[PDB]
């Protein structure tokens, strides 16, 4: 308590492995979150998917056609793992907006499920895409859905897209990271195992949902081919399973870990040794190498669970960039707000799977072009602007570990809300420790 054992000298692995080797040899993996409006087909689509996967029954599916996550101490996010012969996947979902944030934060990319039936670019669709890119998601698959109620009309498909695409781009996306797939969650056409109808093939000639997913995965798996031992290990603690030798579950956001190697957890700053890396939907199956992107469970020696919590951060013992703070600077981008932001204006900071009250402490400067700090004086921050800002945490019960977005692009992002409205996104630029 007064001090946990802590080191900055790497222990070696019981059975050293060639990371680059192990990556190549290994199957690609992708995690994704399934967003979309309330009546867009999210669950019938999910059902259909699992069904083609022989994970859902033929009747389990007829019931759904009139839970699904459940079927496949504090829980932060739900995961469901699955596999094809080409790739491994991990559906991510929160249980229970704050819940969307959790899902989005741990997912590699998003599938945006859209109702094509007879377009109104609506409230919670836009919300989700806004959170998606605020939170670090670059890749999308827009599952253009419910094609039957438009008889697979290329005319309509292309019409909805011409509305949505520009929005997605404005909001912060790039057109080549967006993939557009026509499907029917109900007929299962284009999802996985039921092929596109010939009528449909004469205009849509790109891949189906599943293949598109596998494609994503491969794209990812390649970047991870570089991974060295000169690469930091980063790991979001996502759940702590009770002991009666602790079990820690989370997502690697960087590098790799093998049994024998060591890690420090923040903010507790304990240095534990990992002696088993459990993985798979079970999580009895074990590997000798977890790498970035993998959802896994570490079986830790020298761990003190009372002082570990969801949303904590583990890293290489020689990695010294995670910090806790009252104050830090946000490169802040602002949406449409009711009132402007002023020094002292409080809000809730959302960050990874944690949320936290805070207030603006300083308005430091507008951002004119590129990244330059405009000499224009700034007494208040209004809607649809960007500025460097100093934030202060209030009523802190426990330190939040922070990483700047230069250190890591994903972990370094935060979403700001006040009075129930998503008001701004931010990149952590600097930490005033």
Give the nearer residue to ligand GDP in terms of CB position, either 111 or 277: 111
Buried residues in 359-391 as b, exposed as e (16+ CB within 10 A): bbbebbbbbeeeeeeeeeebeebeeebbbbbbb
Give the nearer residue to ligand GDP in terms of CB position, either 145 or 429: 145
- 409 in a known ligand binding site: no
**Of these, 19, 32, 35, 42, which contacts ligand GDP (CB under 6 A)?**
42
Give the nearer residue to ligand GDP in terms of CB position, either 62 or 201: 62
Q: Is 71 in the site for ligand GDP (CB under 6 A)?
A: no
Q: Is 44 in the site for ligand GDP (CB under 6 A)?
A: yes
* Nearest-angstrom CA–CA distance, 264 and 134: 28
Residue 381 DSSP class: B
By CB atoms closer than 10 A (0-12, 13-18, 19+), residue 155 is: exposed
* Nearest-angstrom CA–CA distance, 282 and 285: 7
- 36 in a known ligand binding site: yes
- Residues with Cβ within 8 Å of 366's Cβ and at least 6 positions away in sequence, in order, are 373, 374, 376, 378, 385, 386, 387
Which one, of 215, 213, 301, 293, lies nearest residue 263 by Cα?
Answer: 301
* Nearest-angstrom CA–CA distance, 25 and 268: 36
Give the nearer residue to ligand GDP in terms of CB position, either 90 or 184: 184
Which ranges of 190-257 would DSSP assign to H, the alpha helix? 198-201, 209-223
Residues 245, 300: contact at Cβ < 8 Å? yes
Give the nearer residue to ligand GDP in terms of CB position, either 36 or 250: 36
Minimum separation from the CB atom of position 296 to ligand GDP (A)? 29
- 33 in a known ligand binding site: no
Give the nearer residue to ligand GDP in terms of CB position, either 80 or 254: 80
Minimum separation from the CB atom of position 93 to ligand GDP (A)? 11
**Of these, 40, 200, 210, 290, which contacts ligand GDP (CB under 6 A)?**
40
Minimum separation from the CB atom of position 57 to ligand GDP (A)? 17
**Of these, 1, 2, 3, 39, which contacts ligand GDP (CB under 6 A)?**
39
- 40 in a known ligand binding site: yes
Minimum separation from the CB atom of position 167 to ligand GDP (A)? 19
Minimum separation from the CB atom of position 117 to ligand GDP (A)? 7
Minimum separation from the CB atom of position 60 to ligand GDP (A)? 14
Which one, of 82, 58, 59, lies nearest residue 69 by Cα?
Answer: 82
Coil, strand or helix at 302: coil
Q: Is 288 in the site for ligand GDP (CB under 6 A)?
A: no
Residues 289, 17: contact at Cβ < 8 Å? yes
Residues 208, 147: contact at Cβ < 8 Å? no
Residues 66, 91: contact at Cβ < 8 Å? no
Residues 428, 330: contact at Cβ < 8 Å? yes
Residues 173-232 that bind ligand GDP (CB under 6 A): 184-186
Residue whose token pair is 């959302």: 350
Cis peptide preceding 267, ω within 30 of 0:
yes
**Of these, 23, 31, 33, 41, which contacts ligand GDP (CB under 6 A)?**
41
- 42 in a known ligand binding site: yes
Residues 48, 191: contact at Cβ < 8 Å? yes
Minimum separation from the CB atom of position 149 to ligand GDP (A)? 5
- 81 in a known ligand binding site: no
- 73 in a known ligand binding site: no
Minimum separation from the CB atom of position 48 to ligand GDP (A)? 8
- 87 in a known ligand binding site: no
Give the nearer residue to ligand GDP in terms of CB position, either 186 or 295: 186
Minimum separation from the CB atom of position 331 to ligand GDP (A)? 34
Stretch that binds ligand GDP, among 31-39, 104-112, 249-257, 350-358 (CB under 6 A): 31-39
Give the nearer residue to ligand GDP in terms of CB position, either 120 or 395: 120
- 29 in a known ligand binding site: no
- 230 in a known ligand binding site: no
Q: Could you tell me whether strands 140-145 and 178-182 are parallel, antiparallel, or unpaired per DSSP bridges? A: parallel
Stretch that binds ligand GDP, among 38-46, 91-99, 253-261, 363-371 (CB under 6 A): 38-46
Minimum separation from the CB atom of position 222 to ligand GDP (A)? 32
Residues 107-166 that bind ligand GDP (CB under 6 A): 145-146, 148-149
Residue 422: how many other CB atoms lie within 10 Å: 19
Q: Kindly state the helix (H) or strand (E) to which residue 51 belongs, with its residue range.
A: helix 42-52
Which one, of 254, 263, 249, lies nearest residue 228 by Cα?
Answer: 254
Q: Can you read off the two tokens belonging to residue 252?
A: 């690697």
* Contact residues: ligand GDP, CB under 6 A: 36, 38-44, 145-146, 148-149, 184-186
Give binding residues as ranges. 36-43, 145-148, 184-186
Give binding residues for GTP as ranges. 36-43, 145-148, 184-186
């Amino acid at each position: 308590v007064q001090r946990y054992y802590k080191t900055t000298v790497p222990t070696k692995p019981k059975k050293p492995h060639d990371i680059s080797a192990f990556v190549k040899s290994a199957l690609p993996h992708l995690s994704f979150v399934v967003l979309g409006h309330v009546d867009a087909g999210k669950s019938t689509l999910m059902g259909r998917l699992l069904y083609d996967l022989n994970i859902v029954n033929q009747s389990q599916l007829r019931k759904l056609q009139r839970w699904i996550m459940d079927q496949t101490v504090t829980v932060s996010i739900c995961t469901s793992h699955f596999s094809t012969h080409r790739a491994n996947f991990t559906i991510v979902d929160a249980p229970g907006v704050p819940n969307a944030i959790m899902g989005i934060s741990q997912a590699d990319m998003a599938i945006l499920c859209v109702d094509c039936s007879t377009f109104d670019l609506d409230g919670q669709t836009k919300e989700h895409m806004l959170l998606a890119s605020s939170l670090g998601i670059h890749n999308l698959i827009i599952a253009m859905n419910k094609m039957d109620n438009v008889d697979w009309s290329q005319q309509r498909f292309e019409e909805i897209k011409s509305k949505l695409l520009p929005y997605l781009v404005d909001i912060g996306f790039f057109e080549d990271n967006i993939n557009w797939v026509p499907i029917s969650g109900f007929s299962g056409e284009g999802v996985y195992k039921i092929e596109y109808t010939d009528e449909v093939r004469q205009w849509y000639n790109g891949p189906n949902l599943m293949s598109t997913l596998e494609n994503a995965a491969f794209k990812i798996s390649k970047e991870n081919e570089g991974i060295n031992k000169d690469d930091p290990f980063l790991f979001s603690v996502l759940e702590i399973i009770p002991s009666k030798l602790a079990l820690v579950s989370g997502k690697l956001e960087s590098g790799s870990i093998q049994p024998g190697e060591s890690l420090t957890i923040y903010p507790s700053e304990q240095s534990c040794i990992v002696d088993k890396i459990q993985v798979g939907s079970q999580q009895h199956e074990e590997t000798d190498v977890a790498i970035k992107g993998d959802f896994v469970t570490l079986k830790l020696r020298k761990a003190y669970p009372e002082d570990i919590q969801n949303g904590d951060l583990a890293a290489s013992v020689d990695y010294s960039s995670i910090h806790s703070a009252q104050c830090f600077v946000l490169e802040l981008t602002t949406f449409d707000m009711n009132r402007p932001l002023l020094p002292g204006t409080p809000f809730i900071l959302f960050i990874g799977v944690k949320e936290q009250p805070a207030r603006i402490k300083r308005l430091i400067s507008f951002i004119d072009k590129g990244n330059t700090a405009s000499k224009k004086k700034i007494r208040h921050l209004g809607s649809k602007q960007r500025a460097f800002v100093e934030i202060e945490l209030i009523e802190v019960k426990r330190w939040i570990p922070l990483l700047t977005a230069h250190e890591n692009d994903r972990l370094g992002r935060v979403v700001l809300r006040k009075d129930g409205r998503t008001i701004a996104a931010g990149k952590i630029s600097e930490i005033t420790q």
